[PDB]
Amino acid sequence: QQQQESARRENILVMRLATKEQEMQECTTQIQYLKQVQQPSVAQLRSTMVDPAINLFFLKMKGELEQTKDKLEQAQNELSAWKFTPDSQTGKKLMAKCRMLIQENQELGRQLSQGRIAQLEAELALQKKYSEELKSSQDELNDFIIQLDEEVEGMQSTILVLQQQLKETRQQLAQYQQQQSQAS
Amino acid sequence: QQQQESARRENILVMRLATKEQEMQECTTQIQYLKQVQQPSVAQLRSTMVDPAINLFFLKMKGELEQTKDKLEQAQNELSAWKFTPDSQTGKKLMAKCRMLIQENQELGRQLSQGRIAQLEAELALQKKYSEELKSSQDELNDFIIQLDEEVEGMQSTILVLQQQLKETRQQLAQYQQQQSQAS
Amino acid sequence: VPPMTYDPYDRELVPLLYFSCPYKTTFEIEISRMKDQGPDKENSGAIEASVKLTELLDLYREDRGAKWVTALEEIPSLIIKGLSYLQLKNTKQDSLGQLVDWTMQALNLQVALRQPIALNVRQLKAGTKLVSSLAECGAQGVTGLLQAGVISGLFELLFADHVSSSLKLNAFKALDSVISMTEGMEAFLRGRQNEKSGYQKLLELILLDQTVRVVTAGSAILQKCHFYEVLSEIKRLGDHLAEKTSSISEGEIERLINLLEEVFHLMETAPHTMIQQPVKSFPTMARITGPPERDDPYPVLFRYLHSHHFLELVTLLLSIPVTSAHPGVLQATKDVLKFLAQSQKGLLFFMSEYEATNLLIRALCHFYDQDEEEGLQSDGVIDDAFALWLQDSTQTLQCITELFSHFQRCTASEETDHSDLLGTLHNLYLITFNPVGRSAVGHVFSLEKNLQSLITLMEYYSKEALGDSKSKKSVAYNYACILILVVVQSSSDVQMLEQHAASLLKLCKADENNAKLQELGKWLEPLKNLRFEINCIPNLIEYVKQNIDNLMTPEGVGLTTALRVLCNVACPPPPVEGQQKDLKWNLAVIQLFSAEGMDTFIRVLQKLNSILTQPWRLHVNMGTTLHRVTTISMARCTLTLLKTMLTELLRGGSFEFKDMRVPSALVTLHMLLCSIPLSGRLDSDEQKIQNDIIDILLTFTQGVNEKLTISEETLANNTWSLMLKEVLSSILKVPEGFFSGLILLSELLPLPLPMQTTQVIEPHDISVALNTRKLWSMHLHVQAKLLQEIVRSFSGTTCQPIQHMLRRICVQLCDLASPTALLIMRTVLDLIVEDLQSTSEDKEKQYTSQTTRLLALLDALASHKACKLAILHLINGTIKGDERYAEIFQDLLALVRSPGDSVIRQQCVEYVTSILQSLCDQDIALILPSSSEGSISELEQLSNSLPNKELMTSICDCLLATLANSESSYNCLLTCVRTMMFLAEHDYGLFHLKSSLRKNSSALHSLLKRVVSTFSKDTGELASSFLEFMRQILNSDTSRTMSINAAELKQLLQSKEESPENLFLELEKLVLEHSKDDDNLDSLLDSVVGLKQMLESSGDPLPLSDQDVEPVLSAPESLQNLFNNRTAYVLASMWFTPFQAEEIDTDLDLVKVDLIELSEKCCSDFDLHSELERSFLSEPSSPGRTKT
């Protein structure tokens, strides 16, 4: 039928136009985000601090100052190193710093060695084993809880049966005590 | 069921789609324009508007850079003044050793708190926390089981007292029945 | 023909078509289905059970033996089918009545006492199961039970002596089933006459000694009774408010807000405190025993809400003029509505009660009109989108029901009417245009197997063709593809994908040449053969670390899904009050750490802040909402993963964590995401990110005890000091981060004391808060050279947000302890003195605008309790090297004594006089003034609130000089008369003021001449303040032992004998000031006429009293003791937002003309910047993975 395919074509155009309205929404919200109503304060902040030229210049200046400072301190300690000599305060301090760094490097080496990693792995395995031991204990505890509830239910049932029998005996005794007294 | 109305609807739909698409073109040109019009140049970088704080930072960094440069040149000429001596050479060698030690000590210290032997310690601590939480929960469940067991003991005592009452009443009833059955 | 112009509120709700009502029980659902559907395939399945039921109640009509007990255990399985079928067939023997008779016979203790050995307790539990199965049977069944007295029959099991606990717990489960229905709940709360109600019996039962699980069940029933009582009280309050105003009290509105908040907090903790836990499940601290299944209490909470008409009530409240005006009613109501709309059950509650829901939506929309009318929605009043979100959520669930009910009608044929299907899909697609509507569509399709409505939709049209255009484009297929793509993209909750990943991947694979299906398949890369448990954490982490390079490249878009899933299966939801912790969340974190998870989340954060860093600078903030949503979801999932890996690791026991890649990356991600919101306020998704950042950084503070702080060589290497170093060094790193670091440090640092709390607090919390502040001060005093640089750098700036946040930091950071406040205040005062001696060396003092900005900073700080005392304990001159501060304060006082004609000095003198006002303000102190007990005596309090006697004499002389000066401004005069008012409130300052007037006897005369010579309708404030102070010197002769009489004051008012002339001129100037605009004119008139009456009531010439007892203050307590003894809690503009409209940057910020290009050759050489910035706008201009 000519109407069915015509309606399908209309559906095609409506689908395309719906996607077009989606892109309208995206572009218009991007416009509203770019040209948003903004305070003077945020514009000042983004034009004075977040200014790309100022940021790049500040980063370059900070980097250059850091490099110059590190080179200066290197040169100062190094000229102290030509001033290194035994039995002098500079010499004693410098050699003591070197030995302290030897000791610290040895400590970091023993704290990073494969032996210490294996020790920590063994401790982790022991902790895991303790965890499955606790879980097995928890399973046993659950079984104990189940058996305790079953015992409680059985005890209540036999309590009720005992109450039944005790009643029946009590009324039988009372009725036969009233009954047998008439023959005295 | 007419086809002329369907054809007219299709034509108006495609016209609306074309209008929406020319709005696509205009809006996307506006998006492309707004997103990249911030052209810097040289004439407006000779007269950059900076905040007083930013200008003060630039002045402070420039001054500190100037003193660091001049004292670094002084350090270099002082290095050049000194001549090679065995103490100076051993000091230079040991200072190079010290710098290498500091570098590799920082590297080892950032491997220790970021590498595998930090994830291992985190795993160990978390496993200990999980095991202690599970053990505390099991300890509380043990007190709950103690409550259930004391309930069991109470019901057992009730069973015993009801059984003794039943026994005494039953024997009393039996003796009374075979007592007054003969005296009637 | 579906129209493209979408009005979000042109569609209303209609009755539920596919999903059943959430509050309807199984029996009511079955009976409605069998009433409207009629005969069906399962009608035979109902009849074989209905015949068994009707034969089963007939074969046992008088027998109560073992076989009867066995039948009692088979009745519950036959209830839902047989009873409904009999009720529909109009049974003439009252099957429900016979079932209730069986239930009550079984539940009695005197019928159990006639049974065999081991089936009497079995009879009792069968009876309680029948109670639970007949209470979930509708109003008919519940009323049939209650008329037989099931509450009084259930409370015979509970009160029975020597009965089991697993039987009393089953009886609690049956009582909860009975009270779940509203009729049973009413019969429980308000019991029969001449009998105790069920509530009283339950309370008496709880007061006994019983097993922990039994009392837990009792508390669970009581917590549901409390919820029902709160709902009924809300109903009564709403009725009062809707009947009084329709023809009002504030208490009945504050209580209503509190009750709505209680309803919300009871629905949060409903699945933990309102449910009956299983018989084998104990209330341990962490769930270790019992079945893992727990029935949800929302199907009965919604019955309570509907029986009380909660939606109609909130509609009334949101439409009553007095209640609509309150901003707390709306927030409290919308919290409850948001919680309801979060779930599938709650959203079906909204849709089932559609008549009330439509009016609720309309009322919320009219609030969006009311906020538009007020115009305050820009700030303060949040830009709420809840009305549109709820409308879109209910509408997309309505469309989901329409989709589902369109496939039920095709279980015996094939689809032929697709106009309705395409209309539904189109009206659902246009919901996905707004970000709010897109979020709603992504949310609703992720709830309880809703995405199947579209998965089956494409599975049906995978048979007509491949899905693309061969003979027809299959428009429904394209709509389904787009809708599944947008829900997968926008839904942060990924529980749907757990069960739909296989189907979605099959759909993507079966049609390889679709533009949307390829992207959907790329969105589901991590979910190929994945089980969504804690054991697949290594797989997800391996996926995230394998393609971390393609972070936001549209090829590695599935990494967002991998992080959403990994945050869904390894991050617990925010814990609520009463919830017992599941132990699988600890195993999730252990697995998240076993596989490298700290490395592959820090790396995700580093890549994210390395990609976002370039567009952020160039004012490109992820324009497209798809990319915005993807980036926000990625950041939030990574932050949640890091938080749950750090909160569960850095808590309780001290564990060293010196990674320092988390804070150094979070200080940058905060810059890129939460630093400069262009809307002036952080939205709903960039505030969760900021809160996550704050929590992760604060997790470096927890776990630190008072043993790592004993030694300074261990204090500086702590896991807290290192975090503080990484946060403080990242502030002065880049000027773009200047504001970000400040706004981050303002959240890290603790709030200023005292806390504003509505209730009294135990001293333990006061002690822990003071200890936290002391620890913060200790960990910040090791970064003294960084705080000094922060406060020396941003001081003098003209960027209003940065200056505001700097003076907020210097308020938070001086409220911690004495050292960290003295540090900042020494820095500020030394900076002021070095600025004043920077250009005035060997010369008289010269003031620039840097000085006035610096003084503005000092004054903004000096108006606070701790900073004022830090100033004071430096400017006294106690020997610690503090002579410079005393000299500079004397210099400021000399400045105020002689301001000059310069326009910048006139702007500094107002700041200095405001500083003087703040210092002399008694109310601004650590020890708040209080004559009663709880604080030191007032005379002993003025020694920690006011300067010493020499400084007080100097300040008094300065105030008199600036009052007598004819060049002084108006704001400075107002501030000085306020300061005189402050000093006139106590004998000490008033004595110093009085002693100052003898060396300057023309000060009052000069001030009065100044105020009467230039009096107008706007300068009347100064006159009113002067008259108030004028009375404050005379309000004590009617009190203060130190004062003056009228005679000496009148003679002090004159240097030439013309004081009556000035007083008269002031009197008749009020008449010509039209004396009618405001009551301030009348107040000033009465004050001036009273003073005029006192003028002629005593002889004027009488010199001021010379010798009298001098009030001497006590020695000033050390600042460390004042901070320790400070009032930590009290019973109860700068903090609302940093982007102030205008405080300093009014129109002239003194931007300095900086010559960057020529300032480059002097320093290290560097090429022209212009090409550098222009190279950044070509490739990384569009959102995506940027080259830099």
Residue numbers in the entry:
A (entry chain C), B (entry chain D): 64 to 247
C (entry chain A): 333 to 579, 619 to 1409, 1428 to 1521, 1530 to 1585
In the authors' words:
The m6A “writer” consists of the catalytic subunit m6A-METTL complex (MAC) and the regulatory subunit m6A-METTL-associated complex (MACOM), the latter being essential for enzymatic activity. Deposition of m6A onto RNAs is achieved by the m6A methyltransferase complex (m6A writer), a large holocomplex of ~1000 kDa in size that contains methyltransferase-like 3 and 14 (METTL3/14), Wilms’ tumor 1-associated protein (WTAP), KIAA1429 (VIRMA), Zinc finger CCCH domain-containing protein 13 (ZC3H13), RNA binding motif protein 15/15 paralog (RBM15/15B), and E3 ubiquitin ligase CBLL1 (HAKAI). Here, we report the cryo-electron microscopy (cryo-EM) structures of MACOM at a 3.0-Å resolution, uncovering that WTAP and VIRMA form the core structure of MACOM and that ZC3H13 stretches the conformation by binding VIRMA.
To understand the structural basis of the MACOM function, we determined the 3.0-Å resolution structures of the HWVZ and HWV complexes using single-particle cryo-EM analysis. Notably, the overall structure of the HWV complex lacking the ZC3H13 component is similar to that of the HWVZ complex based on superimposition aligned by WTAP, although the horse body is slightly stretched out upon ZC3H13 binding. These results suggest that WTAP and VIRMA form the structural core of MACOM with only minor conformational changes upon ZC3H13 binding, and HAKAI is not part of the structural core of MACOM. Moreover, the side chain of R109 from L1’ and the indole ring of W987 from the Neck domain form cation–π interactions in addition to the hydrogen bond between the side chain of R109 and the main chain of W987. These specific interactions allow WTAP and VIRMA to form the MACOM core, and most of the interactions remain in the structure of the HWV complex when ZC3H13 is removed. In contrast, removing ZC3H13 has a dramatic effect, which reduces the binding affinities of HWV and WV complexes to Kd = 562.7 ± 76.6 nM and 826.3 ± 336.0 nM, respectively. Specifically, removing ZC3H13 dramatically reduces substrate binding and methyltransferase activity, suggesting that ZC3H13 is a key component of MACOM for substrate binding and m6A writer activity.
